[PDB]
Design a protein around this ligand. Sequence first.
Ligand SMILES: CC(C)CCC[C@@H](C)[C@H]1CC[C@H]2[C@@H]3CC=C4C[C@@H](OC(=O)CCC(=O)O)CC[C@]4(C)[C@H]3CC[C@]12C
Ligand SMILES: CC(C)CCC[C@@H](C)[C@H]1CC[C@H]2[C@@H]3CC=C4C[C@@H](OC(=O)CCC(=O)O)CC[C@]4(C)[C@H]3CC[C@]12C
Ligand SMILES: CCCCCCCCCCCCCCCC
Ligand SMILES: CCCCCCCCCCCCCCCC
Ligand SMILES: CCCCCCCCCCCCCCCC
Ligand SMILES: CCCCCCCCCCCCCCCC
Ligand SMILES: CCCCCCCCCCCCCCCC
Ligand SMILES: CCCCCCCCCCCCCCCC
Ligand SMILES: CCCCCCCCCCCCCCCC
Ligand SMILES: CCCCCCCCCCCCCCCC
Ligand SMILES: CCCCCCCCCCCCCCCC
Ligand SMILES: [Ca+2]
Lengths: 163, 146, 411, 177, 188, 25, 49
Amino acid sequence: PSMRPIILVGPSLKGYEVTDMMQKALFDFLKHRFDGRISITRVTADISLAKEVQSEIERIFELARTLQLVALDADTINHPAQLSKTSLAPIIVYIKITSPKVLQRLIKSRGKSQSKHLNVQIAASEKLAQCPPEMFDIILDENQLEDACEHLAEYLEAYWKAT
Amino acid sequence: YMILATIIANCIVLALEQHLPDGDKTPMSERLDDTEPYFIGIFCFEAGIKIIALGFVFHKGSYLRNGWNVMDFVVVLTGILATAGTDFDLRTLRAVRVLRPLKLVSGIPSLQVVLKSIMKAMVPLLQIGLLLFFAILMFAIIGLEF
Amino acid sequence: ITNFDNILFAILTVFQCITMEGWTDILYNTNDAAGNTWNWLYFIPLIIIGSFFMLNLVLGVLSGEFAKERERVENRRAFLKLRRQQQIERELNGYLEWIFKAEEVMLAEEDRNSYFRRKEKMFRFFIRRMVKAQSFYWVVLCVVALNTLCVAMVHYNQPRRLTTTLYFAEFVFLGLFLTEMSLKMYGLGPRSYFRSSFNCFDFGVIVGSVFEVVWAAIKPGSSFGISVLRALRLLRIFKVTKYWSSLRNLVVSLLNSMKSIISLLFLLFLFIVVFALLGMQLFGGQFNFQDETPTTNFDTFPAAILTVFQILTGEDWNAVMYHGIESQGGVSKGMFSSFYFIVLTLFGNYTLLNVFLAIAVDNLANAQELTKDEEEMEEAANQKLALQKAKEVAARSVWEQRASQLRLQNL
Amino acid sequence: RRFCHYIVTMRYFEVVILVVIALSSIALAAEDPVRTDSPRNNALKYLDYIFTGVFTFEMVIKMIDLGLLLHPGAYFRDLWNILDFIVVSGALVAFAFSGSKGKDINTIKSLRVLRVLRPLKTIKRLPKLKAVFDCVVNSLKNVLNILIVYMLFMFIFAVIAVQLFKGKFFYCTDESK
Amino acid sequence: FFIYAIIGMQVFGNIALDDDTSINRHNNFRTFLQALMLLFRSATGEAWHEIMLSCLSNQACDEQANATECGSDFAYFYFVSFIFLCSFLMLNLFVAVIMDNFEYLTRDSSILGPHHLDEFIRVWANDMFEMLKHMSVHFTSTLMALIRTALEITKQHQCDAELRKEISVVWANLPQKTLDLLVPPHKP
Amino acid sequence: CKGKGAKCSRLMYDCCTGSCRSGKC
Amino acid sequence: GWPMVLKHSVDATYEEQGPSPGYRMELSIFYVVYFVVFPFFFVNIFVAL
Ligand SMILES: CC(C)CCC[C@@H](C)[C@H]1CC[C@H]2[C@@H]3CC=C4C[C@@H](OC(=O)CCC(=O)O)CC[C@]4(C)[C@H]3CC[C@]12C
Ligand SMILES: CC(C)CCC[C@@H](C)[C@H]1CC[C@H]2[C@@H]3CC=C4C[C@@H](OC(=O)CCC(=O)O)CC[C@]4(C)[C@H]3CC[C@]12C
Ligand SMILES: CCCCCCCCCCCCCCCC
Ligand SMILES: CCCCCCCCCCCCCCCC
Ligand SMILES: CCCCCCCCCCCCCCCC
Ligand SMILES: CCCCCCCCCCCCCCCC
Ligand SMILES: CCCCCCCCCCCCCCCC
Ligand SMILES: CCCCCCCCCCCCCCCC
Ligand SMILES: CCCCCCCCCCCCCCCC
Ligand SMILES: CCCCCCCCCCCCCCCC
Ligand SMILES: CCCCCCCCCCCCCCCC
Ligand SMILES: [Ca+2]
């Protein structure tokens, strides 16, 4: 695409309340911060199969044609390696939970349905942590919403200046 | 836990005693002195259990090889000796009955840990004790002179 | 008893001067017996070299021992765990802030399109921003300071208009604080309200205030003095200063080691009990020779324990020693009962200092390394964050220095 | 004349002022409180007149050199200068009111007590004593955040003590009424 | 002590010496030495509150004192302020003397220090073997070498460079060869 | 409560307006 | 002079009433709790700090 689409890898597998809400908070900060400069869309199709799936690829290029910032809410993308072999060349921003047990307490905090599944979430966090820093275009190991939002917004301002 | 219960009951019985000037006695004092053999029997019972289950000195781990169990043995032995029918036993063998609150420490290991934490910082204070006694002695000699 | 007629009597009087208890009674006695021109040379050097220089020596040795204990492998491990959990608590607070903002915006976008539950949750979330704003905090502080002002004008013979005014003001302030507690419950939940140590204390003080109001309704005279504890909420003023970190960490260390502070104050109680029982054994029912029994007698157990406590505080321990010497005979033959008080004021004025200085040094230091480590990790994280974000766009006290050196040596 | 006032402040004036302060402190130690009409008190009153004159002279020297309060780095910019004003002005005001008229009594004793700040000049005139004072003040600032907590806790305890014992500490001379 | 003694003399000097009060013939403010003794008595906390009450307003004045009304309610501030000022200054003195020796109060037996150097001086009475059997360019060089063994700051040349840097840092007060003498002794 | 100058005992503390010093209030 | 204040505190009966010796010995805990806090703990906080 003209500019790399914004896909965020969450601390744990997507579709779970912890990652869902944290990623959604970042999404909504972006939609307020870059209003008139950014585009946020849902991507339900499995774009890790890229090389219905092909139709969403051309759509991703289409929203990126007009030099508007494009944000993909890809539900199936839970690891940067899923987008290494695609032609999308996305921007990878990693919401990093620096220590595991705070993430454990986070998950146990979300009601009692989220508490049912945990091992998948820790293994997701560890698997995403094993990844090299270079793969993650922007790292978010912060704990404050203002800090992480300002970091990502500053990086996107620099990237827009690049475009 | 029942030993700790009897120790606490014994502390309450000791705190319930009241002394009167010239041989007078509160009516409750007779009851609090008739409740003594129960505590003596229970303490001697645990002493017997810990002496037959463990050794005495020979195993190098035993009753009399633990400093805290030596205090328990002294307390129970003097309690036994407090009914010997002699004339001079009352003034002293009933004055070692005051160490039974310390059986709480002797039974609760965390209290022993905290007590060691207290008393290990007071070992370097013995040199201050020697200095204090030397100063006290020198000033006492000067006061004798003057 | 206070004479230099012998080396034992001289040692007893000198030791009683060392404890600075009635050391001027003896000085005045030697000012009447002899001239007063030279007697200060015996006693003021005595006080300086026995009670001020030796107390300095004791404090120095104890502080050195506490410093050496602090930088030891097991205590170092315990402090490392404490700092780890404080770090994780801060991280969890930040992440829960992320999730709360997200849940708020999700609720907003769901409502812009179960209605009763949605409205209830939206009202709860509005309260939750309300109970965390920097305006509710100042309103609560102003209410507390008005409640502190009311209890501070309660004097004797206050105007009969003031008594009823403060009665109705107590009821009004209780209503306001129940309102605040309920609002914080609703916005935060019992699971998260009691996470804060101050909130648990306030809840306890609200319960105590309600209990005291009910009790005063039952008995219109009694006053437990528990509603005054709402003045400790004025400590929240430190939240808007730079002193918040050190005091919060001091309270955190106190709470963490409270299982070792309760156990410490129980050994003091056990030793006070042992000395009270021994005092009843030795001087029980024998302080009646003066033709009246003193207030500090050893007859009953409350009286014995109060006498032992007063000797521990070191006030008029020499007077109790004189009375206990005369109770057992006199200066002629009862002077070997002065070892009870000597032992109780040596092993009671130095174990009190040992225990309470251990508590104070340990917890104050733990606070110091906690706040210093959190400041240093804040700045280190900021600088690492700078040098990583810019990557992708293209003195100390002698105690702290010695503690670092001790940590190096023990490593 | 300001160069003259400057050189007067540097012609070994500090040691002379220190000697004056020390001698005046000794004079304060020598006064007799119980016998206000003693001849020794009269001699020390004349000595205090001399010392007040010396301090007023130093005071006006510093007036001319530093300037009262206008610019930075001048007089009244250091609290020691205000303390010097307090000492000198109190002595002069007491001297003016010491007309031996008998109209007022309680004021003259307070203005004489105002002299005791005289030794506190040396704490600035000696740099090492000033360093020790600054260390003490730094300690007081270090424990100031715990002094406020201490005073608050003692305030709750004092209010509880009032509520417990307000109006109850009364007694008769006889223990039966 | 001096300032408070003078204040006590001026304000509280003419109170009448009654033996049933706490302003005795032993404990008066009537002279500098007596006022200073009273201050030292209150510094040690010896019934200072009774003195304060004996110094309050409306006390009997002395027979040879011109003023009929003697004593003032300033005694509250006087005695309270003296008590905590003296306590604070004395505690500051205590802490200053404590931290002036904190490397000795926290001293650990294993790590070598001034005691080691005093022991080596006593060694003067070969003997190095016996001393090391009793232990935790003639003698000063051996002192420097044994201090090197005590704590580590080829590796020998790097330590020599460290010692030369230290010598440059702490070059003595116009010494011809004193630190350079140590360097010639630090060569081995 | 013993008046001023009354014979008292130190440990009694019944020495209203003062303290028992040298056996006298 | 803290034990004399303790004696006056316990003996205190009611507002505008004279003392009754021995009355209200439960109010010895106010002074025990006060000593545990200020003379013992807070003063040691100052010393340690
Ligand atoms: C205001 C909050 C933050 C605490 C700060 C405490 C003090 C600044 C204020 C609070 C109310 C004031 C008190 C209100 C009423 C009394 C009783 C009053 O005594 C009398 O009036 C004589 C008796 C009578 O006839 O009424 C003397 C002032 C005093 C102590 C005041 C002293 C100063 C006080 C304690
Ligand atoms: C080196 C520094 C610390 C100075 C030492 C402290 C001085 C400020 C103090 C210490 C004792 C004081 C003296 C205490 C007794 C008096 C008696 C007074 O004269 C008398 O002897 C009274 C009888 C009479 O003259 O009628 C003269 C001042 C003087 C010597 C004081 C002068 C100031 C002194 C020396
Ligand atoms: C270390 C303190 C010891 C205190 C004991 C003092 C005992 C002195 C009394 C025995 C000497 C005979 C006195 C008979 C005449 C007064
Ligand atoms: C002749 C008068 C009788 C009383 C004399 C007492 C004077 C005391 C002598 C000095 C001792 C000072 C203590 C030693 C350490 C400074
Ligand atoms: C850390 C010190 C703890 C000391 C606890 C005991 C002190 C004395 C308590 C006195 C209680 C008197 C109650 C009277 C009941 C009739
Ligand atoms: C911690 C040990 C304290 C032991 C105290 C010993 C006191 C014994 C009494 C002194 C002799 C009294 C003689 C007359 C008895 C009626
Ligand atoms: C940095 C300048 C500070 C200004 C002066 C401070 C003086 C502090 C004096 C404290 C004690 C004086 C005596 C108090 C008399 C009641
Ligand atoms: C007859 C005496 C009436 C009361 C006179 C003094 C009142 C209290 C003065 C307190 C001064 C405090 C501040 C001065 C030092 C900073
Ligand atoms: C008997 C009339 C009431 C007392 C009048 C004067 C008040 C006392 C002066 C206030 C001094 C406060 C002391 C604070 C010390 C830090
Ligand atoms: C302006 C000063 C306010 C007071 C601050 C500290 C006072 C309390 C210090 C008490 C220390 C006494 C020595 C150590 C006793 C264990
Ligand atoms: C019979 C009712 C009164 C019971 C004894 C006094 C109870 C109050 C003790 C202290 C309460 C305040 C604690 C403050 C701790 C920071
Ligand atoms: Ca005393």
